[PDB]
Design a protein around this ligand. Structure first.
Ligand SMILES: *C(#N)C1([N]C(=O)[C]2[C]C3=[C][C]=C(O[C]/[C]=[C]/[C]OC4=C([C]=[C][C]=[C]4)C(=O)[N]2)C(Cl)=[C]3)[C][C]1
Length: 217
């Protein structure tokens, strides 16, 4: 694998979004990973509807604003045959009736791949696939109030994750210096323009390699 990767500058990643007061992290992670794989396929980056996922993917096992899984979102898109654009089906930060309209679908998937639960496997996937959906243990105040630097929380769990996010790259600080570049869905004011540098190769810190996956398209 390369020493560093960043998909943000290669056209794979939409601007940072804000989930607001709704437990829809999993929807933002899933749309991020699908945005990247659709771009890989078509060369067009189109922002996708989290609301469509919150409203419609109940049958696949999601719980709307209470929470969900990225793989259940990718399954919904597969079962549904499509997913509406963000423009056509805007984000409301609350769960309402399914209003999917296939006329406005701009994305599809044919399944998903679960990555082996090792940071080396996650690194290879990020290097060769594009942005990867992952779950992390974000349930500490150090994460809530993160501003900058390489995040390392001594009380983090590698097995109990609570927050879906998107790995867009990795690198190292040339000046415990490796990191994953992680896109959050808490707006641009949080962290570094809405991104966090998560400790890399420090024993699967916060479980970043424990629930990694991407959609196939
Ligand atoms: C956000 N906002 C939010 N969170 C989730 O919705 C959360 C994200 C998550 C956690 C853990 C994993 O991988 C490990 C699997 C855990 C099982 O957790 C389940 C969740 C939701 C439905 C069913 C199971 C869950 O905790 N989801 C992933 Cl991949 C994603 C709401 C705070």
């Amino acid at each position: 694998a390369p020493r560093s990767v960043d998909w943000r500058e290669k056209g794979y990643v939409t601007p940072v979004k804000n989930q607001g007061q709704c437990g829809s992290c999993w929807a933002f992670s899933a749309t991020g990973a699908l945005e990247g794989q659709m771009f890989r396929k078509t060369g067009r980056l189109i922002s996708l509807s989290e609301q469509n996922l919150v409203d419609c993917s109940g049958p696949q096992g999601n719980e709307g604003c209470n929470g969900g899984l990225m793989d259940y979102a990718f399954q919904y898109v597969q079962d549904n045959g499509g997913l509406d654009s963000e423009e056509s089906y805007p984000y409301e930060a609350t769960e309402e009736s399914c209003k999917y309209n296939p006329k406005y679908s701009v994305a599809n998937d044919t399944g998903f791949v679960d990555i082996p639960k090792q940071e080396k496997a996650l690194m290879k996937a990020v290097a060769t696939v594009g942005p990867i959906s992952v779950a992390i243990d974000a349930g500490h105040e150090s994460f809530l109030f993160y501003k900058e630097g390489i995040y390392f929380e001594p009380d983090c769990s590698s097995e109990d994750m609570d927050h879906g996010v998107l790995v867009v790259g990795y690198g190292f600080e040339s000046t415990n210096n490796k990191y994953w570049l992680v896109k959050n869905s808490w707006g641009e004011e949080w962290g570094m323009g809405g991104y966090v540098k998560m400790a890399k190769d420090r024993r699967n810190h916060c479980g970043i390699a424990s629930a990694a996956s991407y959609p196939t398209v």
